[PDB]
């Protein structure tokens, strides 16, 4: 479970970058 | 942007499965 | 923790709707 | 769309805190 949560956190972190980039580009 | 949003959606979908699994196991 | 995971899942579910809507509108 | 993306980012940010807290507690 701990390693799985780590993977989910890493995804959420990538989403912050990706969504902030979309915000900038729009 | 559309392909990027698709990738983010796919991640969020995986998170639903993963978090629901953690809920079941806990 | 179980109730907190439930709240996170609910958010992720809302994101799928919101991101799919953005996909449609773009 | 820009305001909606902002709301999603805010949720993802809360998830990082919440998931990191779960990691610490587990
Ligand atoms: Zn998310």
Nearest Cα of chain B lies from the Cα of A22 at a distance, in angstroms, of 7
If DSSP codes are grouped into helix, strand and coil, which group holds residue B10? helix
Task: Calculate ∠ Cα A9-A15-C21, nearest 5°.
Answer: 125
Mutate to test the interface with C, among B3, B12, B14, B17 (most CBs of C within 10 A): B12
DSSP B26: -
In chain B, which ranges are continuous DSSP H helix? 2-25
Q: Based on the number of CB atoms within 10 Å of its own CB, is B22 exposed (0-12), middle (13-18) or buried (19 or more)? A: buried
Q: Based on the number of CB atoms within 10 Å of its own CB, is D12 exposed (0-12), middle (13-18) or buried (19 or more)? A: buried
CB pair distance less than 8 Å for C4 and D18? yes
The closest of C17, D9, D22 to A8, measured between CA atoms, is: D22
For residues A19 and D8, what is the distance between their CA atoms, to the nearest angstrom?
8
Which of A1, A11, A26 is nearest residue B25 as measured by Cβ atoms? A1
What is the Å distance from ligand 1's center to C15 Cα?
Answer: 7
In C1-26, which ranges are continuous DSSP H helix? 2-25
Task: With both helix axes pointing from N to C terminus, report the angle between C2-25 and B2-25 in degrees, rounded to the nearest 10.
Answer: 160
> What was the resolution (in A) of this experimentally determined structure?
1.8
Which structure tokens are listed for A2? 């701990």
């Amino acid at each position: 479970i701990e390693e799985l949560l780590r993977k989910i956190i890493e995804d959420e972190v990538r989403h912050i970058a990706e969504l902030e980039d979309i915000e900038k580009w729009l």
